[PDB]
């Protein structure tokens, strides 16, 4: 067993350059679940950053950003990548992944939660 | 997957007992056309008759619309009995103990489109079997269909011709035809009318 | 949408087990009247009679109120069974196995606040078919309606005259009249009347 | 509104699967009576007969109590089936295509608490008809009522006298008397008894 | 109180679709016994037979456990039809329209103990009435009970002898005995011994 | 333990109105096979016959998946009626008053997802018995099964060979066999087939 | 729209002051809606103060406010009055009123909310 | 109420220490319930740390405590033990246990609470 979702990236770079982070899976099947990204800040509670479906092509984003982030997923590596381009100083928070069964990205239930990584431009 | 999202998204606020129309003053159009498959028995002198009928309903909805461009595949959705609005149109001269003998059915919706509600039923109706001449005479029985709670300025019920499909020729009665007639009768003190649809089944004997 | 807003707002606190009245000490007026549309079988001396009757109940509610200026268009509000209070007025001397013949139907409400309940039914009642003084003898059969739990200073059952319409003239019996009288089944020491309504059907022969 | 407040407050914790009593080990007392109204028929070859019976169960509740000084107006409250406790008292030697002909109704509560449950019923039970030898033999048919699961130290089922008010005299049989008796049966190895009530219907002929 | 606390606490995580057992590999044992009270009719050529039977099913549940030391009083708890698990033991060669005449009843539990699920009913079951060899021929009719979904390595349904209590001697048929036997049915690809029970009723004439 | 975890965690997002499939364009294969057990009666000139039939429906599901390594023990999960998708397959030329004589049953699933939905039932269906040329002639009665709402490019019915099991040798009629074949009734609108299966039961006097 | 809930009566007074807090509303029928006063302070979330029924009888208060304040309403003017007496330093909070359908003052599901009238000592 | 719980053990090491927390209870049969450890921080939500089912072998660890913290239960002794090794200085909080009926340790509806012990690092 020992189901865990570890996160990395350690992004503390200044605004403008780039950021790239990845996730990993341990116990559950990666071809039957869907992952979404949640942002949590010391003043805020939760934001639906972006999400992808189990099928492979259902990329959904938030109204806050439409052309600054992008997502990708790989099943052989058992990982998902998030790319953060054109860093701005307004978004500084801790990112963590919420896992769920067959879904789309819009409001959904969750069964497994992941680790939090601190990002501050 | 797309069907799951469509199902979860289309029922956000769909209070089942509402009347979905773009305008609250404009009435709504419902089309009615039964299809008779067989008459089971004309029965005794109690003036009852058992027949096999598949009804038909058509109406337009305003709260079930989507664009199929971004939803490849799924084009028709279906809802069970209880969550989707269904008009209360039934038989008036009902002689059955439970009144309504319809086996409820799912409702089909297509694109930004209409609904179809095909119920099958065995109807025990009562007519006027009092042949004027000796017992060998042409009897015309009448089947009445209309709304019970809805009526006037809300549902302008319209009629379409019945069907003459496989009739399963019985062995003791022959029919001549099944015409119908829409009547805007029973205009009471209230200004609005009260439409109704009456179908005539005529048979002499074999 | 005005329809959705009205339907959502009208059911905030409407526990369906409550009697609607501004002051709970004051009694409630309910108008009751029936309309018999058909007769199925009077039967032999088995002491059973089958009739086709549509009920009619009306009352005034103080929890369904609004005015049309705020909500244009809407004038009728329809509620199914379960979400709206309805009096439980039954037939005392019933012989049906189910004991109830009402086909539950939606209730209509007007702007200022009124209720209309029109359930159809095939009532199998009890009588005394003992016409032994030659065939020609007038027979009086009784239908006894009244509340089953409510009684006294809570619900004063007011009566309206019956209806004489489309009786489908029978070939074996004829109706002379349909009187209806309200009575009180007061017990020994109650200090609170228990009203009921009895309807008499009179038929000799044909 | 006082009635609304009372109905909202009284159900703070009333898990319907409870036995209302202050001391759990102490038993409850339930009073039982019946009222015969009519006899329909008793077929010969098969052992079964039909009767018209209105039951009457009375008990004392503990979780449903208030005092009327603070709550003017309401004096009685009614609860449907599903939210209030009701003892399961059934007929043992039933023969209908169902084990319960009771048409459920509301339960009445007053002040500190006293529940009256009055179900009507067209009961069909199996008798012992072996008096074909002598046509003038009185037939003692048995009606056996009692708890199905509760028994002993929990429900002390008492018994009240039957009723003679109204009988709709039959055209083939005549009542002689309606004795009743409570009996007990002892389990295999236990001190807990099981009570039951047996009513004897006696008719000779007509 | 003790009753409220226990009833609220017992259902924290009790998904009703479970198979209570400490180890998922080990099967569960259910005990089955029936009591036949009366025989209604052998009916016509249709090869169908009607009886009156009370079944009795017992099993040990490992999710309803406590001890009376800290919960004085409570010794028997009951659960309704829908929230407590019940085995689906049915009649295979059933001929009733509904296929199941069981009048569902509460399930009884004692302390940290097992359950009893006594259902009553009348069963219309098919047979082979082909004793035309001679009117005086002993007919053997079979009642086949068993699980419908569960079977093999999960439910080792056993058998207990039936009852010979006051079986209301019939006026046309008399029985010699009611033996019963457990049987097994092998599968195409499996070693699981799908069990079943067959009870034989033998009668010549009277 | 593991059983409860699986049962609780498997139904996170399972809107029961779904059509489980990986791709919304690919249709779904449903295997159909019936098994008749007995013929009760042929009735009279109404042209209707009664039969006892157990259906057998098999399909493959995609949202019910796991592997037993991490869930030791449990190998078959079972779901009740309502929480699991079931194809709406029934009989077209049904003459029963209820239109559906299926006693609903649980659904069995395994690790990969194959399902079985065996319902039992007593089917009263119409036929055509008017062989005037020769009173001693073999009668071919047709049973027409198929979907009611789904059709074409979504659910492609496939047929398996029927069953010739212990069909209770009758005493008046003997059958030769039960051939069946798939048919289509493709409509004029669009080019989406309308599949169905037709089973012919051929019987001659005995 | 047209459901404005307006209040008045700001005050910075120590113990011993008498206040006549006034609230007004429009849009809905005032004779068919009960009203209740709620308190919100930074240290807590929300708490009861006092309420009236739709008729004017059997007003309800809280344990800590059994004495002191009184509440009144007149149907012919569309005004709600709260007479506050014998202030104490613990009543530092906002006073936004709530309106529901025919009610009893005690907890109920509300339909119309109001705005704050923060009062501090 | 005869269903309370008590703790044994205190932690104030600088870092990289070892500890053995012990918990016990009475008033209910210690065979039909499962125990889970929970941590509360000064300002934060409640987080799940370690859990074990009533059966005996369902050990569950959080994602950040996989290879460090271990848990065990003694049914005969009526106790539950939590062993901490290679502690990090970011674990400063109050640890209290929660019981539940037949379960696994994953999200559930707990019945009996207790009281916590403070670890400061
Ligand atoms: C509805 O019809 C009326 C009458 O013509 C019109 O005035 C109104 O604008 C229409 N639309 C509404 C009310 O939304
Ligand atoms: C449906 O609407 C969306 C957004 O307005 C649009 O992108 C899409 O092309 C529309 N589909 C069709 C078939 O017009
Ligand atoms: C209700 O009627 C009673 C009867 O006298 C009266 O005393 C009371 O003031 C009325 N209004 C209420 C109770 O609000
Ligand atoms: C209940 O009844 C018993 C009778 O033996 C008595 O001893 C006890 O004090 C009563 N009250 C309880 C158990 O709370
Ligand atoms: C009614 O109950 C209340 C609440 O305990 C009490 O204050 C009042 O005195 C009681 N009145 C009577 C007449 O018992
Ligand atoms: C349960 O049964 C399996 C079957 O081999 C056995 O290995 C195991 O020890 C048993 N006990 C458990 C799993 O707690
Ligand atoms: C489904 O099938 C269509 C055509 O058959 C194909 O274009 C698509 O990539 C497939 N997968 C999907 C839609 O996820
Ligand atoms: C079966 O489940 C186990 C559980 O850890 C997993 O390791 C294995 O990969 C699974 N097998 C397949 C084929 O997914
Ligand atoms: C409708 O009710 C509102 C609310 O009291 C009122 O302002 C308005 O004048 C009313 N309209 C009419 C026509 O009475
Ligand atoms: C009953 O359970 C309590 C739980 O604390 C225990 O102390 C007592 O010994 C138990 N008694 C028996 C007889 O098991």
Numbering used by the authors:
A (entry chain G), G (entry chain I), H (entry chain F): 1 to 121
B (entry chain C), C (entry chain D), D (entry chain E), E (entry chain A), F (entry chain B): 1 to 206
Source paper text:
E3 and C4 bind to a common epitope involving two subunits at the apex of the receptor. In this study, we solved five structures of the α7-nAChR in complex with two nanobodies, unraveling a common epitope at the apex of the receptor, which is formed by the MIR and the N-terminal helices from two adjacent subunits.
We selected these later particles to solve a C4partial-Apo structure. Without imposed symmetry, we obtained a final volume of 4.4 Å resolution and, after map improvement using the density modification tool of Phenix17, we were able to build a model where the main chains and most of the side chains of the α7 ECD and the three nanobody molecules are confidently built. For simplicity, we labeled the three C4 according to their position in C4-Apo: C4 chains F, G and I sit above α7 chains A, B and D, respectively. C4F and C4G interact with each other in a similar manner to C4-Apo, although through a slightly larger interaction surface (~260 Å2), while C4I sits alone. The F, G and I chains are more inclined toward the vestibule (radial angles of 129.3°, 128.8° and 126.0°, respectively), compared to C4-Apo and C4-Nic (133.4° and 133.8°). Therefore, data show that the nanobodies can bind independently from each other but that their orientation is constrained by the presence of neighboring nanobodies.
